[PDB]
Amino acid sequence: GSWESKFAKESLTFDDVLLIPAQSDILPKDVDLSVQLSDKVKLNIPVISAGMDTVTESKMAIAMARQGGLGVIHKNMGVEEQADEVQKVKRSGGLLVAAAIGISKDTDIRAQKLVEAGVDVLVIDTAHGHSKGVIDQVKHIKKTYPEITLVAGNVATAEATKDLFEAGADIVKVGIGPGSICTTRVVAGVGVPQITAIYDCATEARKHGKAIIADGGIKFSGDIIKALAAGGHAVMLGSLLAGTEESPGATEIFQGRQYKVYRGMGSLGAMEKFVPEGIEGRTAYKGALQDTIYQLMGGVRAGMGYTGSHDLRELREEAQFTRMGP
Amino acid sequence: GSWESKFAKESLTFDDVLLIPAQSDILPKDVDLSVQLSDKVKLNIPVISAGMDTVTESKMAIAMARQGGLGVIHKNMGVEEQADEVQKVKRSGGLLVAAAIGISKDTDIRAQKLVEAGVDVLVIDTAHGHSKGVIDQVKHIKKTYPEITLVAGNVATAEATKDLFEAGADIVKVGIGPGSICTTRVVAGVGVPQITAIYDCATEARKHGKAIIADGGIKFSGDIIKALAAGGHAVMLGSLLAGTEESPGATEIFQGRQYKVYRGMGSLGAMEKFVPEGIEGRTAYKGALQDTIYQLMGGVRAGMGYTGSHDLRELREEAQFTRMGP
Amino acid sequence: GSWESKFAKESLTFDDVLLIPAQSDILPKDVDLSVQLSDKVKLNIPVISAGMDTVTESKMAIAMARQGGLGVIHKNMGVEEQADEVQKVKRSGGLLVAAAIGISKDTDIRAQKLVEAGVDVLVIDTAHGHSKGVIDQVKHIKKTYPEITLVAGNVATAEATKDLFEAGADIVKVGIGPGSICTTRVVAGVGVPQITAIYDCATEARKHGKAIIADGGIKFSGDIIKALAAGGHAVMLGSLLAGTEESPGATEIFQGRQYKVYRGMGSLGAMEKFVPEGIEGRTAYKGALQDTIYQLMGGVRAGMGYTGSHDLRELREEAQFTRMGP
Amino acid sequence: GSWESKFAKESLTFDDVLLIPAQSDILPKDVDLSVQLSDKVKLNIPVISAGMDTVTESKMAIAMARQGGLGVIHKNMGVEEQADEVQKVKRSGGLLVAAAIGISKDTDIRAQKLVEAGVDVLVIDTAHGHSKGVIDQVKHIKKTYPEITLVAGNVATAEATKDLFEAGADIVKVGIGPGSICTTRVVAGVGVPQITAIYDCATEARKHGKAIIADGGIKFSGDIIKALAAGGHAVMLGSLLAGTEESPGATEIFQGRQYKVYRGMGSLGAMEKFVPEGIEGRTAYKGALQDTIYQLMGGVRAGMGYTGSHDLRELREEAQFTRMGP
Numbered sequence A, B, C, D: 001g002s003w004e005s006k007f008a009k010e011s012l013t014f015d016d017v018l019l020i021p022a023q024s025d026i027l028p029k030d031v032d033l034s035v036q037l038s039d040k041v042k043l044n045i046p047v048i049s050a051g052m053d054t055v056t057e058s059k060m061a062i063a064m065a066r067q068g069g070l071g072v073i074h075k076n077m078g079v080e081e082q083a084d085e086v087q088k089v090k091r092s093g094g095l096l097v098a099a100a101i102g103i104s105k106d107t108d109i110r111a112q113k114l115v116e117a118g119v120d121v122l123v124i125d126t127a128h129g130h131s132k133g134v135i136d137q138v139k140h141i142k143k144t145y146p147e148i149t150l151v152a153g154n155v156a157t158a159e160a161t162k163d164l165f166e167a168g169a170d171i172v173k174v175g176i177g178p179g180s181i182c183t184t185r186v187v188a189g190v191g192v193p194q195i196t197a198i199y200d201c202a203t204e205a206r207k208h209g210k211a212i213i214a215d216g217g218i219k220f221s222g223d224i225i226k227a228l229a230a231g232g233h234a235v236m237l238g239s240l241l242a243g244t245e246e247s248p249g250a251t252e253i254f255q256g257r258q259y260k261v262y263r264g265m266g267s268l269g270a271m272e273k274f275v276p277e278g279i280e281g282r283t284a285y286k287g288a289l290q291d292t293i294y295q296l297m298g299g300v301r302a303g304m305g306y307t308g309s310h311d312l313r314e315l316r317e318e319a320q321f322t323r324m325g326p
């Protein structure tokens, strides 16, 4: 019964696992990092920048797309403002671009202006995607724009993933509570350790033949490959990209050291009724996006070389982990 | 045998678990936070302030009741003094009030004056409620005042809970060793990690159709919902409320920062023969009770929205957890 | 096979367990703390001070015996010097006294002078008691002095305990690696977490009807009751008693704060060929032995009151624990 | 299936285990520390210094060999430079010496000059030895020089070990990610906790009757004996030897304290395309190699005395561990 199964489940995070090295005949420089997210969207690297007001606006989306990745333009701005940012990305050599939409009544206006601006992928981005509001919005957006790649989230269970894909989503975004600036676990007591959330959701996605985005909690390149090997098609980054020059914030100095503001979309500052679910902090200035992406992808290339993985499909389907203690 | 089963049991604390998000068609603002503790006592929020000399006197009991909660007037004062505090709460618009009683010979005098003062709930509050002294006091108080709501504790086992409810208690208070200022675990080597203590005691309480109060160890709003989802009908708070303006202590300044004194009822200072079982410390001034209660209940509302819980009964009976490592 | 069973065993320390509260009809002040170590030796409290040059000489042995406990005069001094210390203890009202002996060739001379001085218990104290040298010394000492209570150690296994009791030891002392100043685990990679070491050794001792001393790793009163409840008849203390006025060292001041020197018997300073197995450090001045013993025994009394244990036999045979995470 | 077994494996590190003390009739001074690595190579102590530019050049290889150990001359220098270092070691009384070779095209030239210089053991040292490049190099080196002792690595699995021994390696070197200066786990998300890596690889090596070198992650003498007892024939040290006078770096002063530079062979500084897999740091000056080796071997002697191990073979085949928590 439900009473008896209350504590049956046990879950794993990035720090609980390591990839086991395997027979390899490939050098890190020769591995294939490309991923087919939908029949219309292919990325050259499995990295997506987060739809956050301290992470992705036009500058970040352009630089990400230039590296073979993707940017999610945040929705904490006017509808025409969001459309204008998408337009600049499209004007920068026809680069791919994504944009976040909600479930509020203004969504129909927002979705229309973004599609008119040339957006390639719409992201129904909510704190809790296993809801009637999200499922109905997935159906409406897919019915209205059947030629637009649709991401829906955030989820952390197989049942939620099944419901989003069945409602018409092309991609399901995974992550309830793992974020660096996230206080969801502390404030609401809810969450699923990210490695188990990815694995459970990817187990379901394999039945549908559709992709998942592993969103949140990635601290280093090692966590990227672990996220992909657990079942994620691509990863979403907030913290690792917030300190780059290309993020929306201004570079400020403090006691001789340069910093950039990084905040949760559920923080008081971002929300300006709901109690905060994110913090506002200062992160070290990391220089250009180009440098950070190269170091992170180099780490992924090393791990694929250790696992004998020629491409991401082989890494997802064959790579093995070991569990460990602290 | 007893020798062979010495280390069979394994227990969980708040930090070992998280609630799993589920299908939801309800917004945090629309969830129902009310709880029926007894046929005569209904709270609008599942929060009770602790019977401690640095937490609850008339001011705290009035503010708590005003928020839909309850206050437990501490017994570390004269019998007529305790009766006077209850009287002020009753004079403040007929608000609900509780008062702590012991097992000492002066209890008959104390219980009579509190009942005459209009007390709604008597709390037989001891460090160890699974005792002959407590069970006999439960029988006596219930026989003398059958119209008064009776809480008895503290316990951490199913057998203890069964014995207290069978002796005539309406509500059983759960918590042996989890408190913030508590040194019971360190000093006496006794205790049950609070999530397992709640679950084991609520498993028994379900058979009797009676309520349990999850007492101690709550550090944030996330721990409140975890305490309720593990089986608690309401939670008891010490640390989270000690820094509010409404607590009995005076606001003192230290190096430009404001603080309030918070101490265990088993500390040297509070006890003024038994060796101390609590510490005396300084806690950050948090301002008004009203602000702290709103932030804590907002966090509970978010978690119920993630779990799809419309009310606390559904959260207790259906919500699922996951276990995790450090 | 031995290869396949290399990592089969799993062990518990003090910090992994807590005692479960049980039905109680006894107040902490009324519990019985006495223990029958041998037909000739009964203690009023289950506490023995360690045979260490920074813990027990005549002053500590007198004060310990006065509290109902026992002191082990260390052997890092001349044979006649050790005999002189035992003599002072016996001259102080016929109080009980113990003295440490080794396995070296000078032991016959040392054992004779200590017995002539009126020693009640001889302690064959070695870093590794599961050895041919110790077993032969047990046989020799018991054959020579059949009327003297004989302790032999240190061990951490059932097979070792069985071998020491069968060789003629009356009491087996348990503890390989748990000490506060001990570097045995770090230096030699050997040890058994103390709760499992006590339990495994007490499981064997129950078959022989003989006592065990739980030696090392006790940081607070809570660890004392856990040590006894896991199967120990009495506990041995080093760290908790080193800072008392009665320990052999002189009280020294450092930046306005008083300290006492505490060192392992395997430290460079104590040993003055073997590489050190203990450190030399400064511990906080705790005042009189009388005060420390009262606080520690008060904590034990509280735990026995929570467990419903009237005496130590009931605590050893019936008390139950719960395991927990960090 | 591969999908279902993704998280089946669980692994142990040095800090998760302790050796269980056993029946002993041997003193630490009388234990035998010698090991037969190949029919041509016998060491008097089971210690090999690492092939790193901050650990082993001629000075370290001479001192190590003088203690009964072995040094691995690093390959981050000219072919004739490496040959010159080997020559100095051979000129110092015919002491044993080892030298590292890669899988690059210049290897044939390097291997020939080292063999001509009198090298006793060639070490095919790579970050990932379970590769086509390494296996082919093992075959080539063994075919060319059948009279030279050949080490191949690094590996962490039974299948990898089997493949290296079958290709013709005499000794397999174990260690993927455990190093002190190693960022492989963090950067590439790959690794096997070292105790399990040794055990799994030694399980396979027992079938072939060949030796394994436990490489990396040893912080103290206790970790050396644990590494050997888990199945390693000898251990390889980097961190523990980097601070000795005999290491290639120069002794530098910082705020009155002496330090030596210690860096990973995958650090930016050492590599001077691949992203770094090691850090560059300052380690405390430990004085002479002779002193450090004596303290480390003394600790190993103590542990063998506790386990009753007369020699390393008995320690590998019979010694038992216990698992524990943090």
Ligand SMILES: C[C@H](Nc1ccc2ncc(CO)cc2c1)C(=O)Nc1ccc(Cl)c(N(C)C)c1
Pocket: A126, A127, A128, A154, A175, A176, A177, A178, A179, A182, A184, A265, A266, A267, A274, A275, A276, A277, B024, B026, B027, B028, B302, B303, B305, B306
């Ligand atoms: C204040 C908080 N803010 C955010 C903002 C962005 C987020 N982005 C991702 C995640 C995933 O942990 C959580 C987030 C929370 C938030 O929206 N809570 C929240 C909690 C429960 C429910 Cl049912 C809902 N529904 C969407 C109404 C919203």
Ligand SMILES: C[C@H](Nc1ccc2ncc(CO)cc2c1)C(=O)Nc1ccc(Cl)c(N(C)C)c1
Pocket: B126, B127, B128, B154, B175, B176, B177, B178, B179, B182, B184, B265, B266, B267, B274, B275, B276, B277, C024, C026, C027, C028, C302, C303, C305, C306
């Ligand atoms: C000194 C200590 N003080 C307190 C005071 C308030 C407490 N309130 C709650 C809890 C729960 O950990 C413990 C508390 C200990 C205390 O009463 N110990 C204590 C220990 C064991 C037993 Cl059997 C008893 N019985 C009631 C006689 C009392």
Ligand SMILES: C[C@H](Nc1ccc2ncc(CO)cc2c1)C(=O)Nc1ccc(Cl)c(N(C)C)c1
Pocket: C126, C127, C128, C154, C175, C176, C177, C178, C179, C182, C184, C265, C266, C267, C274, C275, C276, C277, D024, D026, D027, D028, D302, D303, D305, D306
């Ligand atoms: C240096 C060290 N010193 C001490 C001194 C007192 C101790 N007292 C207790 C314990 C228990 O961890 C260890 C101790 C180590 C020590 O004696 N090691 C040691 C290690 C292994 C063996 Cl087989 C032996 N045998 C007695 C010859 C001695």
Ligand SMILES: C[C@H](Nc1ccc2ncc(CO)cc2c1)C(=O)Nc1ccc(Cl)c(N(C)C)c1
Pocket: A024, A026, A027, A028, A302, A303, A305, A306, D126, D127, D128, D154, D175, D176, D177, D178, D179, D182, D184, D265, D266, D267, D274, D275, D276, D277
């Ligand atoms: C940059 C790094 N540097 C080093 C250098 C020395 C090392 N020595 C030992 C270990 C074992 O963790 C790792 C090391 C990494 C390195 O070589 N990575 C690396 C990663 C994956 C593969 Cl498949 C390969 N193959 C040999 C081409 C190399």
Ligand SMILES: O=c1[nH]cnc2c1ncn2[C@@H]1O[C@H](COP(=O)(O)O)[C@@H](O)[C@H]1O
Pocket: A050, A051, A052, A154, A175, A177, A178, A179, A180, A181, A182, A183, A184, A215, A216, A217, A218, A236, A237, A238, A239, A240, A263, A264, A265, A266, A267, A277, A278, A279
């Ligand atoms: O305030 C917030 N609360 C909880 N999660 C958040 C919040 N803001 C953003 N997130 C999530 O955290 C991710 C960033 O994770 P990070 O890379 O670990 O910093 C975003 O992509 C969101 O899914």
Ligand SMILES: O=c1[nH]cnc2c1ncn2[C@@H]1O[C@H](COP(=O)(O)O)[C@@H](O)[C@H]1O
Pocket: B050, B051, B052, B154, B175, B177, B178, B179, B180, B181, B182, B183, B184, B215, B216, B217, B218, B236, B237, B238, B239, B240, B263, B264, B265, B266, B267, B277, B278, B279
């Ligand atoms: O001195 C004490 N020792 C042990 N527990 C205490 C003491 N004083 C109060 N408590 C308990 O700790 C609770 C407060 O827990 P907190 O909210 O974690 O601070 C109270 O409601 C009591 O049940």
Ligand SMILES: O=c1[nH]cnc2c1ncn2[C@@H]1O[C@H](COP(=O)(O)O)[C@@H](O)[C@H]1O
Pocket: C050, C051, C052, C154, C175, C177, C178, C179, C180, C181, C182, C183, C184, C215, C216, C217, C218, C236, C237, C238, C239, C240, C263, C264, C265, C266, C267, C277, C278, C279
């Ligand atoms: O140098 C040493 N190495 C290891 N154990 C030691 C040493 N000296 C004393 N011990 C043990 O540690 C105990 C004291 O433990 P403590 O009370 O945790 O400080 C003594 O009774 C001895 O059994």
Ligand SMILES: O=c1[nH]cnc2c1ncn2[C@@H]1O[C@H](COP(=O)(O)O)[C@@H](O)[C@H]1O
Pocket: D050, D051, D052, D154, D175, D177, D178, D179, D180, D181, D182, D183, D184, D215, D216, D217, D218, D236, D237, D238, D239, D240, D263, D264, D265, D266, D267, D277, D278, D279
């Ligand atoms: O940069 C590096 N990355 C990873 N492992 C390294 C690196 N450099 C050396 N190692 C390994 O780490 C070992 C030294 O380990 P340590 O004794 O724990 O410092 C060497 O013998 C190598 O196997």
